[PDB]
Amino acid sequence: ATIHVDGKEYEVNGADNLLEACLSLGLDIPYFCWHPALGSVGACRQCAVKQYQNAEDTRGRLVMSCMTPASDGTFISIDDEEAKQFRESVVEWLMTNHPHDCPVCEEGGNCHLQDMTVMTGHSFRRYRFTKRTHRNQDLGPFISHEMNRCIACYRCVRYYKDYAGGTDLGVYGAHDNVYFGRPEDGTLESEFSGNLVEICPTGVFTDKTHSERYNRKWDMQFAPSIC
Amino acid sequence: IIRTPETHPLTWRLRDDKQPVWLDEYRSKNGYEGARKALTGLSPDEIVNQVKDAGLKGRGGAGFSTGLKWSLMPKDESMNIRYLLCNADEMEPGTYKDRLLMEQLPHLLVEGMLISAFALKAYRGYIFLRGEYIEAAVNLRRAIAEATEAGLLGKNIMGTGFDFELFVHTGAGRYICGEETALINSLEGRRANPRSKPPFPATSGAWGKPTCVNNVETLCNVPAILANGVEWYQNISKSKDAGTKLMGFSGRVKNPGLWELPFGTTAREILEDYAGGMRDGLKFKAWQPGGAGTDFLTEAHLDLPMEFESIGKAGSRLGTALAMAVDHEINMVSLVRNLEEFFARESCGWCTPCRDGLPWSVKILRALERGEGQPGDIETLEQLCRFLGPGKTFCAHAPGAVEPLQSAIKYFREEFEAGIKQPFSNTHLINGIQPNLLK
Amino acid sequence: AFELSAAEREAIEHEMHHYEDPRAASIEALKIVQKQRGWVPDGAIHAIADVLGIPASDVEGVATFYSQIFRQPVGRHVIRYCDSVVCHINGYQGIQAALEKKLNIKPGQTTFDGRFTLLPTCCLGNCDKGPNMMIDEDTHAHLTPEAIPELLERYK
Amino acid sequence: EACPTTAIQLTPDFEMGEYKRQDLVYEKEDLLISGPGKYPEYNFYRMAGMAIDGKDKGEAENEAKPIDVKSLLP
Ligand SMILES: Cc1cc2nc3c(=O)[nH]c(=O)nc-3n(C[C@H](O)[C@H](O)[C@H](O)COP(=O)(O)O)c2cc1C
Ligand code: SF4
Ligand code: SF4
Ligand code: SF4
Ligand code: FES
Ligand code: FES
Q: What is the C-alpha separation between C143 and C131, in angstroms, rounded?
């Protein structure tokens, strides 16, 4: 296909959505609810770009790039001012109830929400009201649960249920009291439950074994190895 | 006012003792003759063509054409498992019409099911009804039992060979279930999260099968079209919206109620003739044309026909055409605070702008109620109204949520500005750190 | 422990006959358990999950999604007053104040003897007769704050 | 400047000369004074969302009490 991003022409696969097509080219669009292996659901409303109808269009329309196909001759803008303002607004809305926890959070320096808060350029807090809180569950020896940090992006339930085929992790509740976890305290029964520590873009699901002897990602000495 | 069958096709067979009309009385008052004609002399495709040519639009608030919705169904004969759903949820505040039309005329709804299911080639039909309408559920189940006893439902209906089964599904009390894709999700026993479109329910709806969702009033308009013809329905009103509509005013008026009126009837006509105007010592201030999810309009907009395009060009929506009248002594900030509390607790929680931005507006409106508003709060409400519009959120709950807020800010900004009585403070002084005194 | 009775299981199975997927009877199964017991206890989620063949997480998500499925114990009668916009214009605040003064509880809480539980609800579809209030099966309209004690007395 | 809890501070003291270079490696008991230093009232755990002893969920600054999903309110 052929897409025009910010006046520049790119050749992308037409079967792809706009978010994964633009991420493949190296363009930075913030995203939370989308994952390459899980598909697109359009929940978090973070991947907004402005799609124009043709080349000589000025108004445009804010669309979600994860839900928009990368069809031939598609004109979009990522760095438009309205799209940037909407993406910063979505980050701010996620930040209204987020806890003041980054120093004592195992995902600090490893957090997709931190990266997308910085990437949208949102750093000034003008929300002044109470933040909703939550009580945590015991998920067993491996996964630590901290529901305060949730941005309600549905990656955990989509992975664990639709992808991994697990049955003991769902979304419960309503309007903004959505809760993610098990119906009761207990060990997560999936053999692939540990991938939640990387599927979750926040510090809700964390590696408890890493948490007992914790260090940040910049302090790690890594190597490529085989399990 | 007398009601002839020609100008009141939905309410002429009502009873004066507010009692339901059962099968014998319904058949005596020209019942199931449109269904008999449609199922014994008409192909489904020409019934869909008759509905499309009659200009029947949806009565659920969207105003979409019913025939064009029915024409989105696939032409393939391999997909023969098809569903007709009735949005009897009626959870929008200010709406009280489907309760009346299902408690008093259930067989009109059943006949509409029969005709629309035969037209859609839909083998099953479900009435997604809210759980607070106990009498409507009892009457609908009794009507379905009577129609099954009379051979109008089940297998081999009236000798045609069309098999159709009708169920009543009582809901569990959530407003978002009224959204058609969320209605499909709640019918499947899931959390009523709405679905993205495309694909539409006509292609893959209930359990992935072709499925058409229609309001109670649309399916009650269907039998009159099939019984009295198409040109009769087109010649009800001399307007671009064909047929009649259940309209009416509610709230601090002399005679709040529901009346069947042709399209193009002005709202001042309804208020000053059927509602009887405002009560004693009350000055009319504002009005919502179509329930809680519509923009407020002022008294200057009262001389306006209750059509879709006329209300839409005024900066609102016709909606369910059940107007609510707000008098002078009701504070606009308190009214919008109540509306936003409803909309922010009836969110489904799927998408971030509704889920995390309606509660922010609720808290801002609570602060403006208490006189604890701070500068920038009205700007935050305006930015929320601009960023919760169509396409920004996953479904249309949040645009309908922010319509009253932006309309009340547009027409009654002085009260919101009167809510702001304290300086903006987001931080507290930390002893030892000098603050960054921004200008 | 929890155990479904025979009548509850028969009603759930008969509701499962009405749909081509047994998951679609989850809302009605929760409502059946709620009718028989006043609310849905913790073991009822797993019991309904075992009957329907769906995960208990799905049943719990449905049970906590919908407002009229009670996952906490309630009183013998659920007072549900409409707090929506038309009843706000018609003055439900007097009704709520009268109910709070008569029952000596906050909304969402239950009295000491378990007689009434006070809950705000959404619009009851009776806006032309507001303010409305739905006790267990009966909707009461044209309410006034002086008629609350005479209306609550008939619900023993 | 990096500390989000105001734990680490530089005092007005300069007399730190030593005989052995190994004795210039100050462990935690050599650094942890018995008071608040230059910032006398800031408490990070009074602001953090994470629960510790004496401070449950919802007891931090600008936090509401947690609402259970089983609660009867709509
Ligand atoms: C938030 C929301 C709530 C809705 N609630 C209802 C409802 O309670 N009843 C209804 O008939 N339509 C409701 N609708 C409209 C439906 O999406 C749909 O248009 C309608 O049920 C069927 O379309 P029709 O008007 O062509 O019959 C709602 C829409 C939204 C966005
Ligand atoms: S989840 Fe991310 S943003 Fe939230 S406290 Fe942890 S590191 Fe900070
Ligand atoms: S727990 Fe994590 S993965 Fe799940 S919805 Fe919340 S932020 Fe997303
Ligand atoms: S706008 Fe979003 S969160 Fe709100 S009801 Fe619709 S899909 Fe759900
Ligand atoms: S990444 Fe597209 S809406 Fe979430
Ligand atoms: S607003 Fe209360 S019954 Fe509709």
A: 6
Range of the domain at B288: 244-327
For residue D37, give how far its alpha carbon lies from the nearest alpha carbon of chain B (Å). 10
Let me know: does B232 contact B256? Beta carbons within 8 Å.
Answer: no
Q: Which two tokens stand for residue D25?
A: 């490696």
Contact residues for A121 (Cβ-Cβ < 8 A; gap 6+): A84, A88
Residues B32 and B79 placed together within one structural domain of the fold: yes
Cβ proximity of B288 and B339 under 8 Å: no
Query: Nearest CA to CA, how far is B228 from chain C (Å)?
Result: 31
- Token pair 């039909």 is at which residue? B125
Last residue of one domain, picked from the residues B184, B208, B235: B235
Any CB–CB contact under 8 A between B425 and chain D?
Answer: no
Does D39 contact B432 at a Cβ distance shorter than 8 Å?
Answer: yes
d(CA C43, CA B226): 51
Q: How far lies C114's CA from each of C44, C100, C111, C147, in Å?
A: 21, 15, 5, 22
Q: Omega of the bond prior to B199 within 30 degrees of 0, cis? A: yes
Per domain, the residue ranges of chain C are 6-65, 77-153
Instruction: Verify that B28 and B154 share a domain, yes or no.
Output: yes
Measuring CA to CA, how many Å separate B164 from each of B39, B160, B193? 12, 11, 28
**The pairing of beta strand B284-288 with beta strand B322-327:** antiparallel
Whether residue B248 sits in one domain with residue B203? no
Which of A8, A4, A7 has its CA nearest to residue A18? Answer: A4
Q: What is the distance between the alpha carbons of residues B127 and B107, in angstroms, rounded to a whole number?
A: 13
Are B231 and B256 in the same domain?
no
Domain presence at residue B17:
no
Among the candidates B327, B352, B379, a domain finishes at B327
Does residue B430 fall inside a structural domain? no
Cβ–ligand 4 contact at B355 (below 6 Å)? yes
Residue B428: inside a domain: no
Name the residue with tokens 């697990």: A166
Which CATH number does the domain housing residue B45 bear?
A: 3.40.50.11540
Distance A179 CA to ligand 5 centre (A): 19
Instruction: State both tokens at A101.
Output: 């926890």
Q: What residue owns the CA closest to ligand 1's atom 20?
A: B60
Whether C148 is in the pocket of ligand 6, judged by its Cβ within 6 Å, is no
Give me the long-range contacts of A178-181 (CB less than 8 A, separation at least 24). Answer: A178/A150, A178/A152, A178/B349, A178/B355, A179/A134, A179/A147, A179/A150, A179/C64, A179/D69, A180/A147, A180/A150, A180/A152, A180/A154, A180/A156, A180/A204, A181/A137, A181/A139, A181/A145, A181/A147
Could you confirm whether domain C6-65 is CATH 1.10.10.1590? Answer: yes
List the structure tokens of C146.
Answer: 């002086």
Q: Do B314 and B344 have their domain in common?
A: no
Pick the CATH number of C77-153 from 2.60.40.10, 3.40.30.10, 3.30.70.1060, 3.75.10.10: 3.40.30.10
CA of A155 to the centre of ligand 5 (A): 11
Taking an 8 Å cut-off on Cβ atoms, the answer to whether D60 and A100 are in contact is yes
> Are B350 and B304 part of one and the same domain?
no
Do the domain assignments include residue B259?
A: yes
What's the domain count of chain B? 3
Domain match, B306 and B344 both: no
